[PDB]
């Protein structure tokens, strides 16, 4: 069954790939051009639009980068998609690209103005993964949406509050409950769900739950979804994604990025290694991850959004094509890591006992040892019980790329906020 | 004409694949056994023997490998060849296999002892491409034979000066002449050929030309030819070779190896990666290629022959089976490159005039600027002029395995350290 | 006399500037018409014929452009020039405009016919700076000339020879001698100069000397000489050149261009960006400069002459003005850099003594050791000594346009894909 | 016998080490202070002087570096030396330290002023390894001296000739020099210089000529990794058995020993530490006139020319200010190790390539070997033209991983990471 998953995940990939090759045949792009992320993005944005068309395609002519603006029938694209997915409409593949896009968004744009607009805390952006994704996304879509995104969506509904949209509010309530780990938080979601007239109090509870999820974090899916051009390149190399299988959370995407080759258009003022960092973060869904953890896995320093030289991957219609040069996106990384759904809630040893007289801190597991009527106060009780020093994922590490089955972990010894 | 040569090579490869599949049925071989390079080798060796029989076939019982010799009527194997080839005799396909064998040989053994035996330098082995291959290889075989191989065959005929076979000597001289790129070298062959009774005079001219081929290199074809089991696997999978076409010199063999599965028997001391280096090199006619270039294409390091722990792919009759392990060969590569006939030999600006005080190198096309009666000493003059640091194949590059039409050349550099340059 | 060269340079620039303005008023040219490079060229071309008339002048009338072939008195323009320069002949100003035209030519035309007519290698176009420049140019004009230009002038004489024209030959031999950076090249020009009977040997020695100038590069002045409209537009804007000073190799021409406004007529098949690449290079004496370097200084890429879509700045009299349009030339750049006179030549240890048993070449300085003799062989050896990879102008880099004094250099780190640096 | 060598080389090391520990006990230096190269150098310079005394010893007191100036009887030191070398005078050990010193000199000082003084070419400094070594050095001393050093020494004698037992002294030095040359021709030329009964100006010219030839047709010259005594003393104090383990000057041992060692240097305020590190490291592996590209490779950081270094030189002058003197770690580790050779590398198996792939690159061949298609001066000249700076020597030799104890898998570099230290 783990082998079953890998087979249909792999067929999903094989499809996107096969599609992409067909778009590089139509458009008569060279292998270089097909590997331009900007081109990749337009092709992805075309097929997504086709199932809801065109956009900028970039050719290299006389050593310079030419933007053209192509158009196509949604009907032809929708057929090519089916052809490449072997008859099927294959909605998983569409969703995959949607998640890659959102991951790119989460890493490109700070969603602050949209947060105050909803009467939420502008500093909550770590909870916001998946915010630019549509509500017309799959089970996989909801998996990927962060607690914040969920809370914002339910607030939008309550704010519009002052039939069929009752289930829409209850289902989203459910999804949100499904994200919480603690008994208490889960019960609070029920009280908000069960409310027949969702007033201001319901709003406050959501704002309160949102805030709680900064400390008592939510279980949120992380998937490595790469630009279509990556997959198309792999398929064109003869790679059998169905027969080999593939996983979004394992080694596969890291392994695939080691030997891949993507190029980006880069604005004169911009620093390439930075445009590389942006894209890399998007690829492994790591915009609200520990910058220290990112830097470790990558093997160069991942630096905050305010330190980047990059104006953002996609290129504006009014921008000048004359100053536009391009370069390699450097997408390899020293190690790989499994990605988890969990936020990591806090037998085997809890403490140390010093053997050697040597300057150092002396570890112990503070939560586990420190285990020596309103829902709001119970949640408050736990948040004080937590300190930013508590270790989660005890006994988990990164791996050598040579470590195909993940047998020998590597734990690092280390602000660290991207935004 | 190009779209139909593909169609016919397609047809040829197809037959090998079909024949191999047929032999795998004939011999009731497991999926794993049919892909074992050693089994492939015997199957190939048998068809060639039947068209001038049996050989060893390896089977895993109880986990441990068991070899058993097998005998087949030469007439019966000939029948299977012709069936898998829709009736036609498919000599091209028998030649393809012969070349694969010749490529494997080139990569496995130094051709030193037979070199001193003829009158030639042991340090001429970079010129011995296809010295294992017979004269029973056609025009395809002639192309693949290197400058020194030719030279050796003419010296063997001369040293049998101790009619209808005169014209054989002429034809061979023409092939040899056809490989030289300087006219000076060609005029000298046109001074060996017409010599009606050749003895020491012509043998001295040939050694000189052979020696000259080390610097002013001849044009020798390189063809990627894979072991029959790979083609068999690709046929079994539903790749119609005849319809899709196939090139020996383009992406097709590289793409075929990326996605194939070939196993090999390994002796207890041997390193599987090193064995995988031997097969890879063989597949791509790369025995006498700059190791630095091989490595770059391959994506991992390609090391010299005397740093390799391999006795050779073949298993000799006396070998201990009980101690024999097997493993998957690493035949993949990071990039690909067109295989060439070329030897490399060499208006508008040829240099730069610095306008600005800016730190940089000042490029200039060195070999051209540097380019500025007896035929022997004419060659020497050109030889003295040649510098090993001069670049050839200007603008030609490697390609991504997705780059079918060779659109986007990647021009490498070899700063990523290696283990030599000469494989010998 | 540090700032004193700068004041007299700004004297000439004010000069040309005042002359352009006064000439616009007298041709009654609108401000847009006035800043047109084609009106600039004809106005420039008129003073120079006058001190040795007409040419086409262009107007926007009824929305489109109309050429009018106007004729003014040589004697009257000669008078206008004088009172623009406060009485003086001030021939320095005249030389300036000649150099500007030469740099445009140098960017515009491949001198391939011109080179072969002379029995020179057509591949010598890099050595050709100031080929269209007359002998009637100053010592300013002599400095700007390339090694190959000088060799050509000398070959034309020796050829014309198959009194006081002898002192002419000898003068040119000395001009050339001073461009040479090595003592061997210098001595060899002196053997040419001292020749009792200038014939074939001297032709052969010059050809050899030109060839050596490709690797062992001559020293050639690069001066940034801009169109007269550019200077006239700053002097129209009350900018005081005699006050502020001016350099031809300093920041000032880059500074002037960033603030400047220059238009050009563009044919409907012509790319505006390509026309403006050409003018830009001519503005900075940059025809034979490494494209990598030119590109880095400008920001936007500088392509080879064969990828450009322009047939020149001047318009042929048979060309139709109805389909003719015009736009603003991109004369700006991302950075600025100093212009050298030098062509970058590349005590203490002269050899290595190996410590480690490691595979490598064992460097030694072959010219210097072997120098312990015929002049050709001394030169060949120094040429063989040089590699295209050798770095020149160590420590020297480009500056931010704000950075007015040369305080903080930017040393560029140049691409792995490094071929195609030659504009012709 | 290879095992025999390692045993007595090892005993030699063990001795220096044991001696050094005894000097750190007397002087009551802390483990830190004993690992100061400057202290190491004074201790070494003391025992060398004793057998021909004192000098500056640096203590760390209240966080600052104090120079004192100690004195001792040559008699006491000479006894400590014998005690540590277990009765023996053990002259090998003395010579070892002398070579480390010369190696340090060859990397510190350019010997140019001393070259013109001898009427030799000021650009010959690559031939000058061992020049500051005394003529009172062993067989090991002579091994280590470069052709130039030898030529300079014979010129000094000829120059004194125009102003008995010094006849053998001139002939033996002649012999040593002949022993360094590889080519038949160069060896014969040395004989003509030896056999001359009245060594005039012509003899001088021949030596000058031979010296110059040895820039291209290089001399066989020994390279030995001789480390500061403190390195050894530290190893011996760690309980390490140099006799039982054995040791080699040209193999992995010195690289292996520097990987886990720890030396500190006093560093002048203006100076860059990583540079002082480079100086010492070069000295340690005898690599002052080696290919800077080769050095940089083996080390794993860039080794940069003598004119790019921030360093004023290891030993500290009496008049220098102790107040601005800070100190740091000498970083002496290296990415790889390499065998050191005696040879200069004179130019079966393949001589050329045959391109398989259409790819931009140079196409190698072995120029000398292929180009093999009555005065001694002209014969030598014939060969120097026959040579080009591109000729590869040491075909099929490489560096090794430190993990590669027996040297089984080589690594050949491709050079782009001049290349002359001076
Ligand atoms: C092109 C290309 O497109 N897809 C791949 C690829 C795709 C999935 C997994 C691995 C490689 C790929 C590729 O270039 N490689 C990487 C180099 N490569 C390789 C991969 C793995 C190993 N290895 O870890 O033993 C050794 C090698 Cl030489 C062959 C496949």
UniProtKB/TrEMBL annotation, chains B, C:
InterPro entries, per the entry: Flu_NP
Entry keyword set: Capsid protein, Helical capsid protein, Host nucleus, Host-virus interaction, Ribonucleoprotein, RNA-binding, Viral nucleoprotein, Viral penetration into host nucleus, Virion, Virus entry into host cell
GO BP terms, alphabetized: symbiont entry into host cell; viral penetration into host nucleus
Pfam family for this entry, one: Flu_NP
Compartments where located: Virion; Host nucleus
GO CC terms in record: helical viral capsid; host cell; host cell nucleus; ribonucleoprotein complex; viral nucleocapsid
UniProt PTM comment: Late in virus-infected cells, may be cleaved from a 56-kDa protein to a 53-kDa protein by a cellular caspase. This cleavage might be a marker for the onset of apoptosis in infected cells or have a specific function in virus host interaction.
Main location: virion
GO terms for MF: identical protein binding; RNA binding; structural molecule activity
Function in brief: Encapsidates the negative strand viral RNA, protecting it from nucleases. The encapsidated genomic RNA is termed the ribonucleoprotein (RNP) and serves as template for transcription and replication. The RNP needs to be localized in the host nucleus to start an infectious cycle, but is too large to diffuse through the nuclear pore complex. NP comprises at least 2 nuclear localization signals that are responsible for the active RNP import into the nucleus through cellular importin alpha/beta pathway.
Family: Belongs to the influenza viruses nucleoprotein family.
Record's subunit section: Homomultimerizes to form the nucleocapsid. May bind host exportin-1/XPO1. Binds to viral genomic RNA. Protein-RNA contacts are mediated by a combination of electrostatic interactions between positively charged residues and the phosphate backbone and planar interactions between aromatic side chains and bases.
Protein name in the entry: Nucleoprotein
Organism of origin: Influenza A virus (strain A/Wilson-Smith/1933 H1N1)
Gene name tied to this protein: NP
